[PDB]
Design a protein around this ligand. Structure first.
Ligand code: CHL
Ligand code: CLA
Ligand code: CLA
Ligand code: CLA
Ligand code: CLA
Ligand code: CLA
Ligand code: CLA
Ligand code: CLA
Ligand code: CLA
Ligand SMILES: CC1=C[C@H](O)CC(C)(C)C1/C=C/C(C)=C/C=C/C(C)=C/C=C/C=C(C)/C=C/C=C(C)/C=C/C1=C(C)C[C@H](O)CC1(C)C
Lengths: 194, 91, 198, 41, 150
């Protein structure tokens, strides 16, 4: 039980990785569905692990905001830039096509899997270092991944919510704003009134 | 922009159809099967599939497939051609 | 023999009298069902406990202020301004902690086995066996939690709640303070009563 | 007469009940007329 | 809230004015010291009091000159809808809960219909004040609220 004193649902015997017996809605009663879920949690997590840094690091520099980068796309011509340099491939139609074409192919590739999407742990070219060589060791890593992935997903959120309300977004920035006067600057002020 | 855009989109679409999404699309068609009213639909109905027109020498693709992907191709392409000249402007 | 909240009447049947502070008082049959009774017993405890501090917190400073030993605003006034940090921050804080410590005793109510996990490391635990009567660090002095001793806690709580009910209602209409209200009554009781005020 | 009590508590119980209700409502209005809102909060 | 508060509505003032003149007109035939006169002067005083309260309680008015109610949930007008309503649901719940307490008391008995046409007033008087705490019907709902057979 990871809700301190709450009986664990039947299906979760705590053997899965990241299994803390949490499923108040029992969306996992169905085995076929749960398996799909385990796969998805990882996917969603993998991105998130990537996204926070993606969003956070540039701001430490000249990102200003994840939001800000999206800003050029709206006006014609862009052209947008990565590090003060326009292009290559600057305009939106080119990026959109490149993204749609490049992406669709990679994912659909996923949608050609059996053996539980290679157990959502493909480990082909992907595990070059072959961390998964050792089963005992491999298991520990999965837990790390999920816990880390979860941590990341949760954080992304806060970014969006924080980003909401404070359209003067400053995920890294807000923190400062918190730091300055943490007592009079908190979400609390945001949960209430002027 | 020229007429060349039509070709790339249609070309890519066709490409997508023939080598990327081709295996999956068929898998689905097999499962879906043809329509049946109480079972099959050719049983009365005068009208039934055309096996011959369906058949093709290429290792995988058929003429009908060409039609659909090309159409998506043309549509997607014409879609880009029009959004260009509208010069629509938003906030 | 038990205590009768009403001498002539008889006690209801679900009131065994094995409970502290039992005087056969359930005229509306709210506790006919036993489960409801357990829940209510716990509820009476806590509603009674908060009221104790609250009445005390509310009343004493008013008294001390009049004495002049210290100066603090009247309870119905602690709220406006004058605190390090805003009102909002305190709330969210109050909420996070209260949320944890309770969403906390609740577990012990459903199933009485949430005494471990103290602190995060598991070395320390709570040893005992009555719901709403935790032990360990909770009872540093180890006063016997004697039944009858529990009788006293409840009585005070029940009393506190009438007081609390009194303070708030008294506040309106009066527009003053409980101690103040008392002084007015004390100065001249026959001329100061609910009658002259309403 | 037990029995008389019994005639009562029939649909005469309805009228005695509603007459009491009507009276109460009427007095309230006489006391607080033309109320379109609850203004005490 | 495209309306203007009644306190500052000309139409709302014209209605109070016109109404009082109508009642005062009738005042003329009866002379002074008189029963009808006192009755009419009492209606006039009841009229002034009415309009006075509406303005006093911040009720908007419409171009018609009559107050209009806001039921959106807006905080300035809970008096208009929400406050009275909760009051209702309390009473409605009370009546229904007491009514259902009676049928359950009656159900396992002799001829149950006998006490549906001839009320057991001792039993009813015993159950009427149970409606005071009827929203602890909620705690019955956690267990024996409604029948499982259906
Ligand atoms: C636990 C019970 C609790 C109760 C019964 C009250 C009651 C009250 N608060 Mg309080 N509060 C409570 C908890 C809390 N308050 C506050 C923060 C405030 C503020 C900031 C204010 C009040 C105010 C008020 C009063 C409004 C006056 C009124 O309507 O007079 C008839 C009222 C006495 C108002 C006040 O003090 O006005 C002078 C006010 O401004 N309260 C916090 C933390 C933020 C609480 C946390 O638990
Ligand atoms: C940090 C969290 C984290 C953890 C503990 C893991 C752990 C694991 N991954 Mg995973 N992965 C992650 C994040 C993580 N991953 C992210 C964000 C992505 C892309 C979204 C992936 C994509 C991925 C794929 C495709 C695969 C794995 C696989 C595995 C398993 C074997 C490889 C390994 O142990 O990595 C070791 C841990 C590290 C090397 C630490 C990484 C830190 C470095 C410095 C990266 C920093 C880069 C910078 C921030 C950008 C193991 C359980 C494989 C598997 O399951 O085997 C069958 C596999 O196929 N991962
Ligand atoms: C666990 C990740 C995480 C972290 C490290 C932070 C950190 C911070 N948040 Mg954020 N937040 C988060 C998740 C997180 N948040 C999520 C998931 C939401 C959506 C509910 C929010 C919604 C939010 C708002 C509206 C605000 C913040 C603010 C802040 C800053 C001050 C703390 C505060 O005001 O309220 C405490 C944090 C919470 C109540 C969120 C609870 C999350 C933890 C893990 C529990 C601080 C940098 C404030 C700010 O920007 O500075 C003025 C601000 O007003 N957060
Ligand atoms: C009805 C069936 C049909 C078919 C088979 C075609 C086929 C074609 N059209 Mg056409 N078109 C059609 C209907 C059709 N069209 C209709 C109904 C209209 C409106 C009336 C148009 C309007 C139209 C315009 C304006 C243009 C075309 C063009 C083309 C050529 C596109 C170049 C290309 O292949 O892309 C890719 C090239 C390949 C060789 C594909 C190979 C894939 C590789 C391997 C990747 C291609 C021959 C373009 C063209 O060049 O001349 C007309 C073009 O300018 N079409
Ligand atoms: C973009 C990828 C692509 C597309 C869109 C097509 C499309 C087509 N192929 Mg082709 N083919 C391809 C790749 C592709 N092929 C590759 C890579 C090979 C070699 C591996 C072949 C070998 C091949 C053969 C032998 C034949 C086709 C034929 C055809 C046509 C089907 C019959 C017909 O149209 O009329 C009915 C159709 C136009 C047939 C054809 O040419 O029609 C006359 C035909 O017999 N293809
Ligand atoms: C019943 C619960 C209760 C509640 C909600 C409060 C709440 C409050 N008290 Mg009170 N108090 C209580 C009981 C309570 N008290 C009791 C039982 C006593 C002894 C009779 C006191 C004696 C007391 C004094 C002397 C003062 C307060 C003060 C305050 C205010 C500031 C508290 C503070 O600084 O944080 C806690 C921070 C700490 C460092 C501790 C706050 C409104 C202060 C005040 O009046 O406003 C500033 C203050 O002067 N309280
Ligand atoms: C040695 C010093 C020490 C330290 C640093 C802690 C620290 C902690 N204790 Mg612990 N505790 C201690 C001694 C200590 N305790 C002793 C001597 C006893 C009795 C023998 C307890 C009995 C106890 C209980 C019952 C609980 C804690 C809990 C906790 C955690 C938060 C709640 C709290 O403030 O305390 C309280 C925190 C990690 C709470 C916890 O861990 O969450 C469930 C909690 O439930 N403690
Ligand atoms: C016979 C004619 C008659 C007369 C002269 C009265 C006169 C009065 N009634 Mg009665 N009433 C009558 C018939 C009559 N009633 C009938 C037929 C019924 C239904 C059976 C009632 C039901 C009734 C109720 C429920 C109440 C009165 C009340 C009152 C008094 C108003 C108290 C006050 O100060 O206002 C202001 C009161 C504030 C709280 C402000 C007043 C003396 C009130 C009273 O005095 O309570 C006992 C009261 O609430 N009457
Ligand atoms: C049409 C669907 C709809 C529904 C279901 C609601 C429901 C609600 N509204 Mg809303 N509103 C609506 C449309 C709606 N509104 C529209 C179209 C407008 C445009 C003006 C508003 C403007 C509005 C305002 C200004 C406010 C509400 C408020 C409320 C809440 C008041 C009840 C309450 O205090 O808590 C329940 C109380 C007890 C159970 C006791 C309630 C949730 C109030 C609110 O925010 O609540 C705090 C409030 O301030 N509404
Ligand atoms: C039993 C029964 C059964 C049968 O059958 C029927 C009948 C008869 C119905 C019944 C009933 C009963 C009753 C009446 C109960 C009640 C209770 C209460 C009142 C409580 C309170 C209770 C109360 C309470 C808790 C309260 C608390 C409070 C507090 C803490 C306070 C605090 C504070 C302070 C310090 C200061 C500031 O400035 C303010 C504040 C912040 C506020």
């Amino acid at each position: 039980d990871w809700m301190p004193g709450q009986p664990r649902p039947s299906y979760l015997d705590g053997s899965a990785p990241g299994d803390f017996g949490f499923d108040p809605l029992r969306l996992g009663e169905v085995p076929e569905n749960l398996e799909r879920f385990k796969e998805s949690e990882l996917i969603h997590c993998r991105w998130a692990m990537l996204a926070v840094p993606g969003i956070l690091v540039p701001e430490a520099l000249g990102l200003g905001n994840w939001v800000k980068a999206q800003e050029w796309a709206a006006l014609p011509g862009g052209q947008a830039t990565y590090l003060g340099n326009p292009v290559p491939w600057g305009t939106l139609p080119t990026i959109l096509v490149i993204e749609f074409l490049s992406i669709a192919f990679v994912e659909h590739q996923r949608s050609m899997e059996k053996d539980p999407e290679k157990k959502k742990y493909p480990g082909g070219a992907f595990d070059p270092l072959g961390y998964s060589k050792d089963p005992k060791k491999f298991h520990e890593y999965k837990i790390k991944e999920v816990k880390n992935g979860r941590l990341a997903l949760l954080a992304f959120v806060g970014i969006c919510v924080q980003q909401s309300a404070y359209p003067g977004t400053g995920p890294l920035e807000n923190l400062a704003t918190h730091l300055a006067d943490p007592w009079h600057n908190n979400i609390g002020i945001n949960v209430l009134i002027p | 922009n020229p007429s060349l855009v039509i070709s790339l989109s249609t070309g890519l679409s066709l490409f997508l159809g023939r080598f990327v999404f081709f295996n999956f699309q068929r898998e689905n068609v097999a499962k879906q099967g043809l329509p049946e009213q109480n079972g099959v639909t050719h049983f009365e109905a005068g009208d039934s599939r055309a096996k011959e027109y369906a058949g093709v020498s290429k290792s995988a693709a058929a003429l009908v497939d060409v039609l659909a992907w090309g159409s998506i191709g043309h549509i997607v392409a014409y879609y880009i051609l029009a959004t260009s000249s509208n010069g629509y402007d938003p906030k | 023999k038990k205590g009768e909240w009403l001498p002539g009447l008889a006690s209801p049947g679900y009131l065994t009298g094995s409970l502290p502070g039992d005087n056969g008082f359930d005229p509306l049959g709210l506790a006919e069902d036993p489960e409801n009774l357990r829940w209510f017993v716990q509820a009476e405890l806590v509603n009674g406990r908060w009221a104790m501090l609250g009445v005390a917190g509310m009343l004493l400073p008013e008294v001390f202020t009049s004495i002049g030993i210290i100066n603090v605003p009247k309870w119905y006034d602690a709220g406006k301004e004058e605190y390090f940090a805003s009102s909002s921050t305190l709330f969210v804080i109050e909420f996070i902690l209260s949320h944890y410590v309770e969403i906390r005793r609740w577990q012990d109510i459903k199933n009485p086995g949430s005494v471990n996990q103290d602190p995060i490391f598991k070395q320390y635990s709570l040893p005992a066996g009555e719901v709403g009567y935790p032990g360990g660090i909770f009872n540093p002095l180890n006063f016997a939690p004697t039944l009858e001793a529990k009788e006293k806690e409840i009585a005070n709580g029940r009393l506190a709640m009438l007081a609390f009910l009194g303070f708030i209602i008294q506040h309106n209409v009066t527009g003053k303070g409980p101690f103040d209200n008392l002084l007015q009554h004390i100065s001249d009781p026959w001329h100061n009563t609910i009658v002259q005020t309403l | 007469r037990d029995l008389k009590t019994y005639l009562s508590v029939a649909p005469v119980a309805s009228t005695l009940w509603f007459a009491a209700l009507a009276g109460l409502l009427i007095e309230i209005n006489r006391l607080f007329p033309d109320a379109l809102t609850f203004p005490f909060f | 809230s495209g309306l203007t508060p009644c306190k500052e509505s000309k139409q709302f003032a014209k209605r109070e004015k016109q109404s009082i003149k109508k009642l005062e007109s009738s005042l003329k035939i009866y002379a002074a010291d008189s029963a009808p006169a006192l009755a009419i002067n009492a209606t006039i005083e009841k009229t002034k009091r009415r309009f006075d309260n509406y303005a006093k309680q911040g009720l908007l008015c419409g171009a018609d000159g009559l107050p209009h109610l806001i039921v959106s949930g807006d905080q300035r007008h809970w008096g208009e809808f929400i406050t009275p309503g909760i009051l209702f649901l309390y009473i409605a719940g009370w009546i229904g809960w007491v009514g259902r307490s009676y049928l359950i008391a009656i159900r396992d008995e002799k001829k149950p219909t006998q006490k549906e046409i001839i009320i057991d007033v001792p039993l009813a008087s015993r159950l009427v004040f149970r409606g005071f705490s009827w929203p602890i019907a909620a705690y019955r709902e956690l267990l024996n609220g409604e029948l499982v057979a259906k």
